[PDB]
Design an enzyme around this catalytic site. Structure first.
Site, short mmCIF file in Angstrom:
data_model
loop_
_atom_site.label_atom_id
_atom_site.label_comp_id
_atom_site.label_asym_id
_atom_site.label_seq_id
_atom_site.Cartn_x
_atom_site.Cartn_y
_atom_site.Cartn_z
N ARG A 168 50.03 28.68 32.75
CA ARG A 168 48.63 28.39 33.03
C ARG A 168 48.09 27.60 31.85
O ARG A 168 48.14 28.08 30.71
CB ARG A 168 47.85 29.71 33.15
CG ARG A 168 46.34 29.55 33.20
CD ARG A 168 45.66 30.88 33.49
NE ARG A 168 44.20 30.82 33.47
CZ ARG A 168 43.42 31.81 33.89
NH1 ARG A 168 43.96 32.91 34.37
NH2 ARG A 168 42.10 31.70 33.82
N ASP A 225 36.98 42.39 34.72
CA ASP A 225 38.08 42.53 33.77
C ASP A 225 37.72 43.55 32.68
O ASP A 225 38.57 44.31 32.24
CB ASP A 225 38.35 41.22 33.02
CG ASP A 225 38.83 40.06 33.87
OD1 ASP A 225 39.33 40.30 35.00
OD2 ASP A 225 38.73 38.89 33.38
N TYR A 237 45.84 35.58 42.07
CA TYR A 237 47.05 35.94 41.34
C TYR A 237 48.16 36.33 42.32
O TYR A 237 47.88 36.79 43.43
CB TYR A 237 46.80 37.06 40.33
CG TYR A 237 46.13 36.68 39.04
CD1 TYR A 237 45.17 35.67 38.95
CD2 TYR A 237 46.44 37.36 37.88
CE1 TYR A 237 44.56 35.34 37.74
CE2 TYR A 237 45.84 37.06 36.67
CZ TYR A 237 44.91 36.04 36.60
OH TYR A 237 44.36 35.77 35.37
N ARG A 297 43.47 44.25 41.41
CA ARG A 297 43.78 42.93 40.90
C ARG A 297 45.12 42.98 40.17
O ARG A 297 45.59 44.06 39.82
CB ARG A 297 42.69 42.43 39.94
CG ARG A 297 41.40 41.95 40.60
CD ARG A 297 40.74 40.80 39.85
NE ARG A 297 41.58 39.60 39.88
CZ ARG A 297 41.45 38.53 39.09
NH1 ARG A 297 40.48 38.45 38.20
NH2 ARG A 297 42.31 37.53 39.19
C1 LIG Z 1 43.21 40.63 29.65
C2 LIG Z 1 42.36 39.71 30.58
O1 LIG Z 1 41.20 39.40 30.29
N1 LIG Z 1 42.97 39.27 31.69
C3 LIG Z 1 42.29 38.43 32.70
C4 LIG Z 1 42.49 36.92 32.46
C5 LIG Z 1 41.79 36.38 31.18
O2 LIG Z 1 40.45 36.88 31.05
C6 LIG Z 1 41.79 34.81 31.23
O3 LIG Z 1 43.15 34.36 31.25
C7 LIG Z 1 41.12 34.22 29.98
O4 LIG Z 1 41.86 34.65 28.81
C8 LIG Z 1 41.74 33.86 27.72
C9 LIG Z 1 42.99 33.79 26.84
O5 LIG Z 1 40.71 33.25 27.41
O6 LIG Z 1 42.01 36.10 33.59
C10 LIG Z 1 41.36 36.66 34.75
O7 LIG Z 1 39.97 36.93 34.50
C11 LIG Z 1 41.35 35.54 35.86
O8 LIG Z 1 41.21 35.91 37.04
O9 LIG Z 1 41.41 34.32 35.48
C12 LIG Z 1 42.06 38.02 35.20
C13 LIG Z 1 42.88 38.73 34.06
O10 LIG Z 1 42.93 40.16 34.24
#
Ligand SMILES: CC(=O)N[C@H]1[C@H]([C@H](O)[C@H](O)COC(C)=O)O[C@@](O)(C(=O)O)C[C@@H]1O
EC number: 3.2.1.18
Length: 363
Positions: A226, A43, A328, A18
């Protein structure tokens, strides 16, 4: 498309990959990275960061582990979510989030997440060898202007940029304890010393903003971010290297991201032969909604022709994403070449999109 990291055939016997990253080097070398999600899509799991390097324009690849986790917890130790940049010296910087416990980085703890840190490595030989990991957050000697109410932060996931004077700018995301709640925001960090030390900018105008990239335009920073549950990518502009922000209307709300949570995407600048500065955005259309994240598309805006609407250029991944984790993507543009890496059913795929750039460039 080439399968760059293959869940079904890889040297680590990883079950999943990923969070891809790409840099086209000035000399034509392609450098990529990905999370090695050894145990599956999750994750919150055991993760290192791989590199894949090509000296034949993406025909063949050399693989390595670019960054290992802190090895403290065989279930939860992870370095992940690469943000990269190439400086004016040619140095390659990678910044990753580091944890070793279960639970969402931003929301789990009401105080500074104790296992959290930001780890940096650099290469001075075009990504052949890396420095030791440098911990940007263990002390106050590396990153200025970090809020006292920080829960955690990491890079914006994708690529940073270089300002005219050589200042390095990286997109970032932060979680802040505010009035008994955790709120997350985009921002930037910058370095004026080739990545040795950094200053953190201030948060953008809206919470629920996270993964993002910025371009430089005539000294300004423009962010595509985002924006969770809005249905679109927000856009902001800063005239003061990330100290203050306002809505950037020509991009704000123009890339739609479908129902549910947002998704990481990439946002880069190219200058076409006619001298126009164009913006290129990769992100899923997500017509099917939520985490399906179908149809990773590439969109274009012309900053020198703003009355012309954002145009879908092509859809490099015209397929449903895997709900376990997909969607992604990362563009890189260099010397009239354009490449993409993206998530595809637990693999990372690579395409050279230079032919699409040629169509835009007219020639
Ligand atoms: C470090 C991490 O946790 N990264 C992951 C991120 C994240 O959990 C999501 O932005 C929610 O963060 C918050 C700020 O609430 O989002 C993903 O899970 C996804 O595919 O959306 C993959 C990604 O590695």
């Amino acid at each position: 498309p080439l399968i760059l990291f293959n869940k079904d055939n890889n040297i680590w016997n990883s079950k999943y990959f990923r969070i891809p990253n790409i840099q086209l080097l000035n000399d034509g070398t392609i450098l990529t990275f990905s999370d090695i999600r050894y145990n599956g899509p999750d994750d919150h799991a055991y993760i290192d960061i791989a590199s894949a390097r090509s000296t034949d324009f993406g025909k063949t690849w050399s693989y390595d582990i670019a960054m290992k986790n802190n090895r403290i917890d065989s279930t939860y130790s992870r370095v992940m979510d690469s943000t990269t940049v190439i400086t004016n010296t040619g140095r390659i910087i990678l910044i990753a989030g580091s944890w070793n416990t279960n639970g969402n980085w931003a929301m789990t703890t009401s105080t500074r997440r104790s296992d959290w840190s930001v780890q940096m490595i650099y290469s001075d030989d075009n990504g052949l060898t890396w420095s030791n990991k440098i911990d940007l957050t263990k002390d106050s000697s590396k990153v200025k202007n970090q809020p006292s109410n920080t829960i955690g932060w990491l890079g914006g996931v994708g690529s940073g940029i270089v300002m005219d004077d050589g200042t390095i700018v990286m997109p970032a995301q932060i979680s802040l304890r505010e009035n008994n709640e955790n709120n997350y925001y985009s921002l930037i960090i910058y370095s004026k010393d080739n990545g040795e030390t950094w200053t953190m900018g201030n948060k953008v105008p809206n919470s629920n903003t996270s993964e993002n990239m910025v371009i430089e335009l005539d000294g300004a920073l423009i962010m595509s971010t985002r924006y969770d549950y809005s249905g679109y990518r927000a856009a902001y502009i800063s005239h003061d290297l990330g100290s203050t922000w306002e809505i950037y209307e020509p991009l704000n709300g123009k890339v739609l991201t479908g129902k549910g949570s947002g998704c990481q995407g990439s946002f880069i600048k190219a200058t076409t032969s006619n001298g126009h500065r164009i913006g290129l955005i990769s992100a899923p259309k997500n017509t099917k909604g939520e985490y399906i994240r179908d149809n990773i598309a590439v969109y274009m805006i012309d900053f020198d022709d703003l009355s012309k609407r954002v145009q879908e250029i092509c859809i490099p991944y015209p397929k449903d994403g895997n709900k376990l984790g997909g969607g992604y993507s990362c563009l890189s543009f260099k010397n009239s070449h354009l490449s993409i890496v993206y998530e595809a059913n637990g693999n990372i795929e690579y395409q050279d999109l230079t032919p699409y750039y040629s169509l835009i460039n007219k020639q």
